[PDB]
Amino acid sequence: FIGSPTNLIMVTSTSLMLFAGRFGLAPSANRKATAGLKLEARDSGLQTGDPAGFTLADTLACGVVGHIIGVGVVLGLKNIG
Amino acid sequence: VYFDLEDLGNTTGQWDLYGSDAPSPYNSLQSKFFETFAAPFTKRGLLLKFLILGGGSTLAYFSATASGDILPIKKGPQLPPQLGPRLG
Amino acid sequence: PEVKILVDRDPIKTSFEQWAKPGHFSRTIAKGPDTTTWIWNLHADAHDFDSHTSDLEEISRKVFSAHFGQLSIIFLWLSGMYFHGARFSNYEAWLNDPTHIRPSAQVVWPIVGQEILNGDVGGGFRGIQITSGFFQIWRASGITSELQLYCTAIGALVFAALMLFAGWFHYHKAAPKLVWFQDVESMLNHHLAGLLGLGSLSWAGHQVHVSLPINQFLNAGVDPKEIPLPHEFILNRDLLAQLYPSFAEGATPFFTLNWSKYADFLTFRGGLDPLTGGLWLTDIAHHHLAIAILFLIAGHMYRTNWGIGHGIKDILEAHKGPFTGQGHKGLYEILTTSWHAQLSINLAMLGSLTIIVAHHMYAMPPYPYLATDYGTQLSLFTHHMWIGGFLIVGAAAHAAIFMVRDYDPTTRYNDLLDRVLRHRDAIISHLNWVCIFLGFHSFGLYIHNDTMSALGRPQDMFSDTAIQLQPVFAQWIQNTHALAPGTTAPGATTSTSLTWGGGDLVSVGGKVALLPIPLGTADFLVHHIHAFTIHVTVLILLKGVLFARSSRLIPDKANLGFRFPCDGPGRGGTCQVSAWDHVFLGLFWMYNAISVVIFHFSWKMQSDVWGSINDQGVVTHITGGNFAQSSITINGWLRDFLWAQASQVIQSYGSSLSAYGLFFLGAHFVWAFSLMFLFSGRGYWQELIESIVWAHNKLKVAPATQPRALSIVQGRAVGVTHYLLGGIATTWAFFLARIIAVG
Amino acid sequence: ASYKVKLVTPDGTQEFECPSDVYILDHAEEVGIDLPYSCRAGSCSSCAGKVVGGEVDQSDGSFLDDEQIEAGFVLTCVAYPTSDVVIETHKEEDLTA
Amino acid sequence: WVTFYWHWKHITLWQGNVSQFNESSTYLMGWLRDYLWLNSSQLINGYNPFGMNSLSVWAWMFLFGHLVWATGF
Amino acid sequence: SHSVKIYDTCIGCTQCVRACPTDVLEMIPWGGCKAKQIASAPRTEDCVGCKRCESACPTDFLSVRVYLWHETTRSMGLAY
Amino acid sequence: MRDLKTYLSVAPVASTLWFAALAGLLIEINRFFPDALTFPFF
Amino acid sequence: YQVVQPINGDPFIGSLETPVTSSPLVAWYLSNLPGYRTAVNPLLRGIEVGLAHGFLLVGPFVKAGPLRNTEIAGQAGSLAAGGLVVILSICLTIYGISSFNEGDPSTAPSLTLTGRKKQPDQLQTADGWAKFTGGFFFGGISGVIWAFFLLYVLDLP
Numbered sequence A: 001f002i003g004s005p006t007n008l009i010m011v012t013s014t015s016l017m018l019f020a021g022r023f024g025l026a027p028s029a030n031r032k033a034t035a036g037l038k039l040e041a042r043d044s045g046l047q048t049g050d051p052a053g054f055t056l057a058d059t060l061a062c063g064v065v066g067h068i069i070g071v072g073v074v075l076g077l078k079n080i081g
Numbered sequence B: 001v002y003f004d005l006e007d008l009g010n011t012t013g014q015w016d017l018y019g020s021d022a023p024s025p026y027n028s029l030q031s032k033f034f035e036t037f038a039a040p041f042t043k044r045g046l047l048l049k050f051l052i053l054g055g056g057s058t059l060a061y062f063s064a065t066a067s068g069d070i071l072p073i074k075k076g077p078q079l080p081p082q083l084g085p086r087l088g
Numbered sequence C: 001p002e003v004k005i006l007v008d009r010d011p012i013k014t015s016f017e018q019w020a021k022p023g024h025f026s027r028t029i030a031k032g033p034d035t036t037t038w039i040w041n042l043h044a045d046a047h048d049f050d051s052h053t054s055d056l057e058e059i060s061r062k063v064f065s066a067h068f069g070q071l072s073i074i075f076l077w078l079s080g081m082y083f084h085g086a087r088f089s090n091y092e093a094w095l096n097d098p099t100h101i102r103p104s105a106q107v108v109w110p111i112v113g114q115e116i117l118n119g120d121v122g123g124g125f126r127g128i129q130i131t132s133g134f135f136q137i138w139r140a141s142g143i144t145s146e147l148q149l150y151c152t153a154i155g156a157l158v159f160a161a162l163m164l165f166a167g168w169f170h171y172h173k174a175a176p177k178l179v180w181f182q183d184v185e186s187m188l189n190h191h192l193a194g195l196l197g198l199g200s201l202s203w204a205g206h207q208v209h210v211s212l213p214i215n216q217f218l219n220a221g222v223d224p225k226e227i228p229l230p231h232e233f234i235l236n237r238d239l240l241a242q243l244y245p246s247f248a249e250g251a252t253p254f255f256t257l258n259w260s261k262y263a264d265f266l267t268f269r270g271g272l273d274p275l276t277g278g279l280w281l282t283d284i285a286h287h288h289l290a291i292a293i294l295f296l297i298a299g300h301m302y303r304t305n306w307g308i309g310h311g312i313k314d315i316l317e318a319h320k321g322p323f324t325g326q327g328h329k330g331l332y333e334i335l336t337t338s339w340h341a342q343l344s345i346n347l348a349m350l351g352s353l354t355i356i357v358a359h360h361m362y363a364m365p366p367y368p369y370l371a372t373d374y375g376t377q378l379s380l381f382t383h384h385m386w387i388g389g390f391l392i393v394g395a396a397a398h399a400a401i402f403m404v405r406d407y408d409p410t411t412r413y414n415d416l417l418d419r420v421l422r423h424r425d426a427i428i429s430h431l432n433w434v435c436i437f438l439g440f441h442s443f444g445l446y447i448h449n450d451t452m453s454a455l456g457r458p459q460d461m462f463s464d465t466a467i468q469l470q471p472v473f474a475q476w477i478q479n480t481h482a483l484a485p486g487t488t489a490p491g492a493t494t495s496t497s498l499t500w501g502g503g504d505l506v507s508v509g510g511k512v513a514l515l516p517i518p519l520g521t522a523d524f525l526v527h528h529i530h531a532f533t534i535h536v537t538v539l540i541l542l543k544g545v546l547f548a549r550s551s552r553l554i555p556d557k558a559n560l561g562f563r564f565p566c567d568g569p570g571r572g573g574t575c576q577v578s579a580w581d582h583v584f585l586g587l588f589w590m591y592n593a594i595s596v597v598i599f600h601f602s603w604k605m606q607s608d609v610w611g612s613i614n615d616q617g618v619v620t621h622i623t624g625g626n627f628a629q630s631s632i633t634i635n636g637w638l639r640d641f642l643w644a645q646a647s648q649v650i651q652s653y654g655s656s657l658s659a660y661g662l663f664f665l666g667a668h669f670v671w672a673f674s675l676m677f678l679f680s681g682r683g684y685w686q687e688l689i690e691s692i693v694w695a696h697n698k699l700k701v702a703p704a705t706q707p708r709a710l711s712i713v714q715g716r717a718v719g720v721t722h723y724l725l726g727g728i729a730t731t732w733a734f735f736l737a738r739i740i741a742v743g
Numbered sequence D: 001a002s003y004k005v006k007l008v009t010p011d012g013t014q015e016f017e018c019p020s021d022v023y024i025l026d027h028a029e030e031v032g033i034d035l036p037y038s039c040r041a042g043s044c045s046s047c048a049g050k051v052v053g054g055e056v057d058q059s060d061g062s063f064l065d066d067e068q069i070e071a072g073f074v075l076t077c078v079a080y081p082t083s084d085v086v087i088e089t090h091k092e093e094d095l096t097a
Numbered sequence E: 001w002v003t004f005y006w007h008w009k010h011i012t013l014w015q016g017n018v019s020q021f022n023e024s025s026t027y028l029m030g031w032l033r034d035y036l037w038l039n040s041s042q043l044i045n046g047y048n049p050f051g052m053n054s055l056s057v058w059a060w061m062f063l064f065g066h067l068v069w070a071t072g073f
Numbered sequence F: 001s002h003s004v005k006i007y008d009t010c011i012g013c014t015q016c017v018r019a020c021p022t023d024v025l026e027m028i029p030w031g032g033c034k035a036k037q038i039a040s041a042p043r044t045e046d047c048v049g050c051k052r053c054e055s056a057c058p059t060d061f062l063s064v065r066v067y068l069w070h071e072t073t074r075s076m077g078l079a080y
Numbered sequence G: 001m002r003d004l005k006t007y008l009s010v011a012p013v014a015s016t017l018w019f020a021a022l023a024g025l026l027i028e029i030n031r032f033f034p035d036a037l038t039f040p041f042f
Numbered sequence H: 001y002q003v004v005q006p007i008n009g010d011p012f013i014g015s016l017e018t019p020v021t022s023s024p025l026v027a028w029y030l031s032n033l034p035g036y037r038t039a040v041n042p043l044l045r046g047i048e049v050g051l052a053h054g055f056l057l058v059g060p061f062v063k064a065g066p067l068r069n070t071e072i073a074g075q076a077g078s079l080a081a082g083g084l085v086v087i088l089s090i091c092l093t094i095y096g097i098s099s100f101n102e103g104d105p106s107t108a109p110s111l112t113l114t115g116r117k118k119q120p121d122q123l124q125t126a127d128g129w130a131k132f133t134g135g136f137f138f139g140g141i142s143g144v145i146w147a148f149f150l151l152y153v154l155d156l157p
């Protein structure tokens, strides 16, 4: 399976969503988006170790989102061309 | 504060919300015509008795002299009649 | 802030002492009886939890364990159904030849000649033909032997005992506290993603491994005993790959994302299976997969314990505009402190859902061999319509209870509720008007039609032959639904249902499963009658809810309660001002509306849908197709529907359908018996009881618990209860006798 | 059984003995310490009073708030003195509020 | 009850079919089917999609009476 | 206006005056009972006729009685 | 256990038992002497 | 900002203000209609009334009555609309007769929307109501006549 097929697409998709979630630019466990414009700060109480306040809950969430978005566009592109 | 013993109608709300009080927009040649010709029908007892008896007149008239194309009740039967379960 | 389990140990102790003291829950009943009225109150207030006490924690504990009791009861009823299918049924023979054996899972003992009720249902068996449609479910499940039915009966009995024990446990040993109940975000996350998501995922799993292969074998013609057992399909997989090659790659696609390679058994066909007259199973499995995905994702919306999610309070507070002031601010505080508000919303939605289920299950039949079983289809549609109507009426009851006992602008203020309260007069005015106008323009057309048909003027009627009223939008929409597959739905082959059209007709065993349903002037008239009845019911219930607290007539109505007889004969007379009386009146109108709905469906299906088809292909409908021309007058409903179809039930004496003939008459009797309670009042009855009591006193045989006449409210309630029972049972006997007799 | 009763009163505080199967009012009627009543049927607030100690059987009491029996007030004419009680008299209006 | 009794007895006597009453009168399904339902056909066919005859005025009145009655409820 | 009458069996419990929703009734001094109190009905032109007072009277038979009589605007409870 | 003996004598349970026993008795009588219109003994 | 306000700031009158009852377009329109032209002769307003309503009541009696297809009698069904005009003007007359007396002022409000005095609308008289009755009736019958006069083919006769 690994080579240059679905692998490339899904890996770059989940990777960019993780890169977003870790930094700002995306709602997260320590970031509460107001109305899709900007983000506030919040200490969820769940302790992490990453210097940017990247929780395991955050990682799981953005990983699921990367997989959903990658599955979507993969099926689209392979159904139209 | 909307309570004023002096003016009661403003406290109980006796306004005209859509009245105008503007001058007439029907210039007098048109008004002239109407209030000249449309006067004799402006007395209560006169109008009522006239309307009743004239409507009755037209109804008795058009009822006594209506033609067959109008009312099947007038054209009568056009067939021989059946006999009842025994009688007829 | 965070979410956790919170429970108390041993709140109440298991004892019998409170069984021997009737009415322990209420201080007034506990004191004991002086008059017979006591015995009635004891039952009327038995489940009025929030009136026995003031503490919200206690009410919620009681509600939780009462729910466990209800679930235990339901499991016991399921256990009975499966045991009767296993032990006193002809299910195996019906499995052998479904279009000749009529299903039966109840036999009677030969005691007083009643064994005549054990009729010839085919297959070497004599009993009562059932109409719940359980054989169709068991066939769609893959069940092929009575041992599986026994096994499920035993499992259900076990589960019922488990539910009962949990009901005892959560009330007497480990009772959760208020903060546990009041966590709605975690609750919604679990019910969306855990109960509905995992449920339909697991069920899609069972259909992919059991129902699909066993039904493939059954439709291939194989003897129901020579089909492999389901677990074989799981142990040996070449069995599966013979019927569906895609099961050879076996989850490699689902990961390689080439879901195309599953098109074997996950399809998007649309339409019916022309062998069994039901939906393709390969469509239902794919449907359940999709629904499970959707729910599992939707159960991750609300924030519980990790920041991510949505706060319900935030969503509600964000919504407001220049017409509604501050609206939705203050509904989270209300919807978390009153059980009655929750119950009203939930009842409204569940009733509407049941009605939608009725429509969708007639129009796109889910089970195999259900569409040609006419009695089961009629029974299911009618049953579910009645349930939906009742639940919708209860919704109004509990909205009124919330308005009388719980609404409080001093400590929980919401803007939208306040504004609706501040223009209720205009609201009720406009609804009143539209119901009058709708009643003139639908029933009035029928009266015009009857009078023109009796006056020898049929060219002046409202009908397809004289003055047409074609529902252009309905015809336009079903034409769009006909052209949909291929144009606006390129992935579909046939359209969703056969009622839309396209000239496709499905037959089974020489019977008609489905074909395009024609819309005409009569359909237009009937639908406007339906709009009229629903609008009237709404007027009554909403008037009851909006004026539950005060009126221009009685300005402190909330102080008299939710259920009171009147406020005396003054002010002109104020009988039936309470909201309970509005619910009481709305029950009659719901009965009216649902009755007309089921009459319209029953006559229309026989007239233009059901029937028999010939090898040459000429369809003969049960009734001759007389709905288009006889439904437009009232005389046609009295003559061609009631008088002509009551023949089956008034001729069942001496046959196996004679129980329906007995119930017809019994139901007429109970209906007429209620009018005595509805038309009279309790003063007359108490004064008659006076003289009867004298006669008993004359012989030292008079009772110490002094007999009273019933309450005013109890009189009304007994009246409506017997009225509904009589009417619905009459229609029940009529329908079942008629549909079972012809076919 | 016949526990001793204590009634504060503008006349003073006096005791009388009287069995538990009785209503307080007829028992203050026995020895002769006058108390205010109107109804003798538990349907008004003239015989109202509150308690200093113990508590009194209010099973056959009616026309009372779903609280008047949980924060002190009692009607003397429909009340059974389960214990050696100490009660108040002439207590209608601070009950009437 | 009185007039139902009189009319059923007499209508079966006028038809030379007295045994019909003598057999069907002893149970209430007999009254419902053999008297009420059986004797209603012509009245309710007074007018129908295929025309009207002189029973029309009764077929109409029959329904009037059913309407007024129900409004009384 | 309806009629309201008070009879000398009254024990002066005041329960009827507390119940009236239109303030028809009143207590006045007396000498025929332990309460030295008796009900009176000075304002019967405002009585809506609800008999809320009769449900409250404890004597057997009643000591307050309401006889419905000629109807007016106030008696019918009309806000228009 | 005494409380159970009391509870079993409350009105609905007592009547339920009384009538179930009566029903069994009449049912068995009619199963033994079916279709009786008269007293055929003496 | 909010759109609904109590009627003229008084929150204890039984009504409200909306874009439906107090809006500039609606206010100006409803003001320029005959019934709301307070300072105009009752008979002129009644004339407008009767004209418009006879003309309107032509159509339905023609296109729906019993002789709609018989056209040796289809068009002349304006007789019916004339009769309806006669009947509801008899009703107007008895209403005015019972509701008023000449020796009494006209019950209309004397205040306006801002708190100035007006001369009470005379349509609410006995005299002026009989005048308005005559106007409406004259207009109604001659409007029936007018819309019967236009029997020339247009789009749907």
Ligand code: CLA
Binding pocket: B052, B054, B055, B056, B057, B058, B059, B062, B070, H065, H066, H067, H077, H079, H080, H082, H083, H084, H086, H087
């Ligand atoms: C009890 C007496 C009675 C009589 C004699 C009539 C007679 C008539 N009705 Mg009628 N009807 C009655 C009771 C009666 N109705 C009741 C109680 C109802 C309520 C259910 C109805 C409801 C009803 C409807 C819905 C309709 C009729 C119609 C008709 C007309 C049908 C025949 C036709 O086409 O004429 C010839 C056609 C004409 C247009 C003749 C018009 C009559 C003259 C020209 C009107 C002049 C009026 C006059 C100025 C004053 C009015 C009355 C005055 C004497 C006080 C006919 C003249 C139909 C009709 O034609 O509508 C008008 C019709 O639509 N009726």
Ligand code: CLA
Binding pocket: C063, C064, C067, C068, C071, C180, C181, C183, C186, C187, C190, C191, C194, C195
């Ligand atoms: C995945 C988790 C989950 C699941 C599956 C359920 C399922 C259910 N809940 Mg529940 N709930 C949950 C989490 C869950 N809940 C959480 C987290 C909370 C708040 C903390 C609540 C609070 C709650 C309340 C207040 C109520 C429910 C109720 C119900 C029942 C609804 C009626 C119904 O549809 O019956 C469908 C019937 C079946 C599906 C038959 C199978 C029954 C299975 C065995 C249920 C087992 C699930 C349960 C969570 C097991 C935990 C017990 C374990 C410790 C031994 C249903 C069985 C109602 C109820 O309790 O009725 C008694 C109700 O009143 N729930």
Ligand code: CLA
Binding pocket: C043, C044, C045, C046, C047, C048, C049, C390, C391, C392, C393, C394, C395, C397, C401, C562, C563, C580, C583, C721
């Ligand atoms: C989830 C469903 C649900 C739930 C949990 C409740 C719960 C409650 N309801 Mg409610 N209600 C519902 C649905 C529901 N209702 C529906 C669908 C309706 C519309 C009919 C109503 C209408 C309603 C009213 C009008 C009232 C309530 C009231 C109440 C409260 C007290 C009920 C009680 O104990 O009375 C006791 C229960 C009985 C006495 C049993 C009655 C037996 C019926 C009449 C016989 C039915 C015949 C049977 C089906 C078949 C015949 C068998 C026979 C031949 C042997 C309680 C909190 C009462 C209240 O005051 O709220 C505070 C109140 O008066 N409900």
Ligand code: CLA
Binding pocket: C432, C435, C436, C437, C438, C439, C440, C443, C444, C447, C536, C539, C540, C585, C588, C589, E067, E070, E071, E072, E073
């Ligand atoms: C067959 C009996 C019957 C009839 C005809 C009605 C009729 C009506 N009910 Mg009622 N109802 C009934 C039984 C009946 N009900 C029973 C048994 C109960 C007890 C549960 C109720 C309880 C009830 C309630 C609680 C309410 C109603 C309401 C209404 C009115 C609804 C508005 C409407 O549709 O206007 C249209 C009128 C009709 C459809 C009647 C027929 C119209 C005829 C055919 C027109 C003929 C006109 C004729 C030419 C007159 C001229 C004749 C001339 C000689 C004078 C309506 C008048 C509701 C209401 O008032 O709505 C505002 C209301 O809330 N009903």
Ligand SMILES: CC1=C(/C=C/C(C)=C/C=C\C(C)=C\C=C\C=C(C)\C=C\C=C(C)\C=C\C2=C(C)CCCC2(C)C)C(C)(C)CCC1
Binding pocket: A014, A018, A059, A060, A061, A062, A063, A064, A067, A068, A071, C293, C297
């Ligand atoms: C710490 C660390 C780091 C970092 C790392 C990372 C970055 C990680 C990550 C990550 C990951 C590794 C992730 C993953 C993910 C994924 C997920 C989380 C998923 C999922 C899934 C799901 C759940 C799905 C489902 C579905 C849907 C939804 C639809 C369709 C169907 C399906 C089934 C597909 C560094 C090197 C710096 C340093 C050292 C260590």
Ligand code: SF4
Binding pocket: C565, C566, C567, C568, C569, C570, C573, C574, C575, C576, C681, C712
């Ligand atoms: S007692 Fe009965 S009749 Fe009298 S007002 Fe009350 S509800 Fe009406």
Ligand code: FES
Binding pocket: D036, D037, D038, D039, D040, D041, D042, D043, D044, D045, D046, D047, D048, D075, D076, D077, D078
């Ligand atoms: S006298 Fe009023 S309570 Fe005893």
